Design a protein around this nucleic acid. Structure first.
Length: 371
RNA sequence: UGUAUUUGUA
């Protein structure tokens, strides 16, 4: 009110910074073209010893963020030089996370990025602390910002934290961690995906029927570059428990996605008469083996609250109609799937009670109409 | 008959 009458040279910037209306006033001044540079430079010299304090402040964080839109490269580098050792403390802070996201979002150069990355390194931030950040209500937004803003060549501290011991569990089975991990996997390098997948496969039993972990397995199954090993690797680890996994709430979805993936690979090959040959040969043997397992365990699966979905997915002629040495396979498939259909039809009166009997009957009928 | 989305910081 009378503050606006004073010359900028005489303002008490640190006091204004932590005050709501003082802070709004400074932001307006930064948005004032005639005075922007001068208020920026004057403010900067007075508030620089308090960079960390302001970043964490309920009102100061708004000033710091605004400042990011106006700071010179020199000014921003000095700011980052001041606070990089404190990135953990900042990231878990409800105000700090907003400040740091903005800072990352407006980096000028590689020097600034490397300083930030240095702060997240083990010199200043422990692996345990990085895991905490990944799962933290506030911190996970900072990790995600790094993931989308920085080159994957900088992802070292994140990869290291994930693959350490059993941290893959701690992260994949967490509400926030599961989402962060998917973001990471969508942009990181193939070799970085491999290192994480090794750990995911190693701890598969603690992931496959987890409420969040199951989404991670499914995410891997959508990465085509993993086909050459992931299919066989997953099936080798799980084949003996395939029926039980099919009958559980969360893992049943993983089974369905796995089966649909097998169908899509094999049919895509046949349409072209596209995945590599070895991916295709592997898929054929697993599908046939899967049909055998579902055939043996048909009585449990058709009756189970979750298993019936996996069964229906395997039975759906929409998934495999082109399938009705590709010559020998297509012949073996038609035989095994036809046998499963007739066994299913025989069982229909035994599940008359269930609400999904008609759906299974329709699929049986659809098979007949196609053959 | 079947699963996740955090942030409306003044």
């Amino acid at each position: 009110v009378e503050i606006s009458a004073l010359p900028l040279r005489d303002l008490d910037y640190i006091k204004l910074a932590t005050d709501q209306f003082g802070c709004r006033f400074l932001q307006k001044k930064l948005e004032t073209p005639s005075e922007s540079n001068m208020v920026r430079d004057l403010m900067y010299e007075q508030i620089k010893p308090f960079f960390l304090d302001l970043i964490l402040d309920p009102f100061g964080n708004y000033l710091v963020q605004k400042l990011c839109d106006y700071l010179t490269a020199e000014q921003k580098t000095l700011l980052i030089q001041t606070i990089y050792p404190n990135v953990f403390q900042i990231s878990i802070n409800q105000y700090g996370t907003r400040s740091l996201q903005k800072i990352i979002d407006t980096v000028d150069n590689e020097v600034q990025i490397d300083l930030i990355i240095k702060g997240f390194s083990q010199e200043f931030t422990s692996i345990e602390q990085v895991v905490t950040l990944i799962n933290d209500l506030n911190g996970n937004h900072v990790i995600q910002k790094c993931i989308f803003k920085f080159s994957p060549s900088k992802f070292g501290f994140i990869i290291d934290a994930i693959v350490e011991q059993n941290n893959i569990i701690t992260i994949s089975t967490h509400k926030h961690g599961c989402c962060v991990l998917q973001k990471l996997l969508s942009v990181c390098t193939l070799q970085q995906i491999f290192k994480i997948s090794v750990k995911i496969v190693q701890f598969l039993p603690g992931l496959i029927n987890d409420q969040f972990g199951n989404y991670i397995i499914q995410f891997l199954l959508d990465i085509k570059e993993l086909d050459f090993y992931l299919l066989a690797e997953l099936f080798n680890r799980l084949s003996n428990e395939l029926c039980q996994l099919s009958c559980l709430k969360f893992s049943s979805n993983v089974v369905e996605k796995f089966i649909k993936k097998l169908f899509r690979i094999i049919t895509g090959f046949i349409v072209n008469n596209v995945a590599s040959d070895d991916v295709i040969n592997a898929s054929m043997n697993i599908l046939l083996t899967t049909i055998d397992i579902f055939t043996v365990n048909l009585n449990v699966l058709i009756r189970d609250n979750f298993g019936n979905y996996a069964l229906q997915t395997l039975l759906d002629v929409k998934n495999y109609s082109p399938l009705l040495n590709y010559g020998n396979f297509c012949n073996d498939f038609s035989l095994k799937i036809g046998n499963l259909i007739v066994l299913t039809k025989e069982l229909l009166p035994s599940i008359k009670t269930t609400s999904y009997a008609k759906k299974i009957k329709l699929k049986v009928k659809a098979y007949a109409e196609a053959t």
